[PDB]
């Protein structure tokens, strides 16, 4: 009995590899996110379930994330291209402290600074004063205030017809390539998965920019589930997803005006107007006992991978960078720096809550220092409601003696926001050419 | 008001099945090497002329075409072009396994077989190329005596 | 300083003729699918050339998966289902053009494709290896 060779088509062979992906707006159902260079898609991608397949995923090691980060950065730069640069601002300022109709916790904040600035004709000049913050100018030698970033990268202005709200995004599969999907509920970020189905497009994904808390995220199935690779390596981070959301009120407590100043030919800058009314400070407000129930669920889920007679302690974070000092986000085209150093005073054996917030204007982007974009102050009263879906936790090293472990917030690498969503999907290559042995023989 | 109905085999419908039975969905599996989005792409096919992004899409399309050409051309080198399967004249080397066929054809799947035989590759390619050369043209030249 | 000496058929000249007679000019179209070349402008040139390549490879792949590859017109073993039309064999071949027939059957395409793929796979290739052994 001699045996022979045969060669086949159609064998599904999987090679874990990398490719450029395929943008998809949800039928382009409609600005920064005007997303004209993207594709209208089916709101009902077809879903095919499988059998018998086990498959390993590897969270933190997926090239979807890096492509996502580059694409969102380049689209962010694309939106801010055609608008008017702000080069002649780097003259000095004649300032004075605002001493009119003060409130308690807004001392030293607002300043009144007047200066020379050119008109649209070269041969002239003018006098302009505008109301400015304290987090934006520096002393020189009234006192004399120059600006924060004139001895570094330049400053432009976003156009006022350009919204900041995120839009749900789908990714889909380029030809020749496939996407697999797991359906376990308690599936940790690595390890196998025996329940396999496949699609051609992702679900709706919102590019949400947050700094300390998962906002507008995805709720889990059952409870708190905890995601990290190596909890003994305390240099890593710990990704935590909730079950149930937390409603959170934060609002701009003030009434606001805005000027419109001419710079040059076709060059108009928007400065801050003059405030109608008195002065307040921005605040944030949450439930009381629901937070306690939430951290009770936290304690209930921490007990598996480490000790339960080990006592749980919360603390303020280590401090430092304003990227990770306050919790920041993008409600209503404005950026909020909220003093979260009161919510994390806790230690447990395993109505209204109010915190102040801060506002800036000169906004460096993701981690880059070679870019600076200025927002126009929006008039009126801003109110923003959202949810809270998860936390990013850091633990110190050297925590010996089997109890009283300390947890702190942090994690200023915003790819983990994407890792907190894309933990289900995997891109793989098809190689349809296969061989096999058999007993038959061909003929001449 | 959209209701669904009757069924077919479908894309990747037999990846966890017995190879002797899963050997018959090769058509639907092999159709989508050049598609998968078989839908108004033409407008963005048109107006993306002054950017790098349509250039990268052009990169992707040309690369996919070349991969299909590499596969079909390498099959075309052998005398098995234009077919789904073919038998040949290389005797199997029983050094590579000695399992009976009743386990492979009944209780073994494709990815298992992939993880088994993944080092014997280029030897098999060379032997198939040899039998598609030796006496496939030489004795065929000797079979060209009319 | 030229003259004109027409010999062969026109490009799509037979389109207004009847199907069974216009079946004999099928060469000229496939003769004229991939020619015409025989800053922004070269960009859209390459765009057009890539589109032509893609459609030609798509249709040759659809030829190749069927057992009617390489050659021109052929046969099969799928018996006709009369749920699509019910003519009596003269009204089509002698009394109907191609655009008429295309507007008559442009809802049943994918089923016919799939069933030809089915009969091309099944009882043709596993059956071949059944016949390749006593």
């Amino acid at each position, epitope marked *: 009995e001699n045996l022979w060779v045969t060669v086949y088509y159609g064998v599904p062979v999987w090679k874990d590899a990398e490719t450029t992906l395929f943008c998809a707006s949800d039928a382009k159902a409609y600005n920064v996110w005007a997303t004209h260079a993207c594709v209208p898609t089916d*709101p*009902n991608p077809q879903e095919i379930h499988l059998e018998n397949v086990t498959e390993e995923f590897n969270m933190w090691k997926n090239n979807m994330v890096e492509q996502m980060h580059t694409d969102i950065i380049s689209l962010w730069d694309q939106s801010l291209k055609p608008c008017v640069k702000l080069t002649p601002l780097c003259v000095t300022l004649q300032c004075t402290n605002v001493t009119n109709n003060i409130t308690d916790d807004m001392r030293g904040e607002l300043k009144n600074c007047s200066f020379n600035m050119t008109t649209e004709l070269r041969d002239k000049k003018q006098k302009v004063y505008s109301l400015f913050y304290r987090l934006d100018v520096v002393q020189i030698n009234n006192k004399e205030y120059r600006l924060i970033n004139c001895n570094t990268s330049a400053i432009t202005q976003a156009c006022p017809k350009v919204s900041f709200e995120p839009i749900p995004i789908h990714y889909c599969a380029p030809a020749g390539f496939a996407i697999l999907k797991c359906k376990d509920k308690k599936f940790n970020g690595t390890g196998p998965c025996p329940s396999v189905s496949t699609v051609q497009c992702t679900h709706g994904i919102k590019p949400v920019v947050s700094t300390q808390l998962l906002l507008n995220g995805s709720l889990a199935e059952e409870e708190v589930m905890i995601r990290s690779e190596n909890i003994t390596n305390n240099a890593k981070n710990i990704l935590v997803q909730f079950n149930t959301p937390v409603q959170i009120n934060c609002t701009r407590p003030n009434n606001n005006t805005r000027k419109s100043i001419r710079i040059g030919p076709g060059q108009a800058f928007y400065a801050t107007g003059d405030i109608i009314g008195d002065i307040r400070q921005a605040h944030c407000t949450v439930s009381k006992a629901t937070w306690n129930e939430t951290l009770g669920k936290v304690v209930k889920q921490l007990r598996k991978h480490f000790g339960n007679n080990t006592i749980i302690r919360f603390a303020n974070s280590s401090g430092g960078d304003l990227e990770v000092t306050t919790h920041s986000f993008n409600c209503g085209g404005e950026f909020f720096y909220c003093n979260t150093s009161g919510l994390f005073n806790s230690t447990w054996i395993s109505d209204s809550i109010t915190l102040p917030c801060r506002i800036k204007q000169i906004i460096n982007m993701w981690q880059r220092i070679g870019q600076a974009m200025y927002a126009p102050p929006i008039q009126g009263v801003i109110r923003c409601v959202s949810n809270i879906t998860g936390l990013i936790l850091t633990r110190d090293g050297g925590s010996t003696n089997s109890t009283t472990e300390t947890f702190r917030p942090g994690g200023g690498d915003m790819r983990d926001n994407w890792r907190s969503e894309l933990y289900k999907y995997k891109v793989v290559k098809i190689e349809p050419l296969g061989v096999a042995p058999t007993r038959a023989k061909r003929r001449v | 008001a959209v209701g669904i109905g009757a069924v*077919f085999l479908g894309f990747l419908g037999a990846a966890g099945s017995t190879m002797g039975a899963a050997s018959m969905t090769l058509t639907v599996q092999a159709r989508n090497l050049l598609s998968g989005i078989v839908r108004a792409i033409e407008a963005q096919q048109h107006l993306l002329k002054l950017t790098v992004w349509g250039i990268k899409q052009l990169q992707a399309r040309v690369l996919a075409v070349e991969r299909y050409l590499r596969d079909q051309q390498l099959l075309g080198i052998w005398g098995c072009s234009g077919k789904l399967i073919c038998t040949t004249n290389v005797p199997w080397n029983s050094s590579w396994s000695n399992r009976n066929l009743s386990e492979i054809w009944d209780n073994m799947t494709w990815l298992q077989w992939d993880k088994e035989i993944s080092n014997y590759t280029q030897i098999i390619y060379g032997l198939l190329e040899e039998s598609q050369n030796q006496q496939e043209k030489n004795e065929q030249d000797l079979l060209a005596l009319d | 300083a030229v003259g004109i000496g027409a010999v062969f058929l026109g490009f799509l000249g037979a389109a207004g003729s009847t199907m069974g007679a216009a079946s004999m000019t099928l060469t000229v179209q496939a003769r004229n699918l991939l020619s015409g070349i025989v800053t922004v402008w070269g960009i859209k040139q390459l765009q057009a050339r890539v589109l032509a390549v893609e459609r030609y490879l798509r249709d040759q792949q659809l030829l190749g998966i069927w057992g009617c590859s390489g050659k021109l017109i052929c046969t099969t073993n799928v018996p006709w289902n009369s749920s699509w039309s019910n003519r009596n064999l003269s009204e089509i071949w002698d009394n109907m053009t191609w655009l008429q027939w295309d507007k008559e059957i442009s*809802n049943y395409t994918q*089923i016919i494709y799939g069933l030809l793929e089915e009969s091309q796979n099944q009882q043709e290739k596993n059956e071949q290896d059944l016949l390749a052994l006593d």
Partner: antibody
Amino acid sequence: RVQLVESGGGVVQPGKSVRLSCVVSDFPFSKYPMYWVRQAPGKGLEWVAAISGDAWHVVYSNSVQGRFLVSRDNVKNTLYLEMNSLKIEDTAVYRCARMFQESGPPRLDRWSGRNYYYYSGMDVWGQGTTVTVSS
Amino acid sequence: DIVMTQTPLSLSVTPGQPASISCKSSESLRQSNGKTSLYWYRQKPGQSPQLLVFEVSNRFSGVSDRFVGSGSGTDFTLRISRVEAEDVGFYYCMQSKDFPLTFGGGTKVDLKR
């Protein structure tokens, strides 16, 4: 033109069975699916059930599920509606109806195999029929 | 399921007096093709139901040109014009986006008695 017929109404008791009828004049029935609606005497209105173009797609509601049956011959131009395991609160008016336009042949999706059907809502009614359930 | 709402039910006006009836819901009833599912129906007591329109601002054969509605996306509406004798009765809103099919509230117009 096109004119509807709704027979089989009155008063019954629980624990029974019915067969209904709807024959509508001069209409093809090879291309047209059709519906059922329901008029409670307290002005309750609710969709009931739908048939395909050729009896190949059966979708019911929640309360009627696993109890009723729809069947149809298009040759005899005759519709059959049969009900079992009768509740007392089934007291209402039953009315036969038609689709707005005709759908065509079924659509296929090649990347799935899921042979799709397409529907759209109704246009016209008839006279209806009234079956009430009491003790 | 996919549900909806109407305006308040009763209405009693005089002839030559336009008004507005809306119909909101919980979802965009846009389908894939761009056709957006919305039916307006009416009847009276002692009267079978009747077809008024079949789409957003698209009316049916036999209906007068007095009755053309509006409203797209998730807010759907209707505008009464030229109040006449036969303008009384029940006014219905209907979905056909997905199973099951839903029936609205049934606003009503009559005269003063």
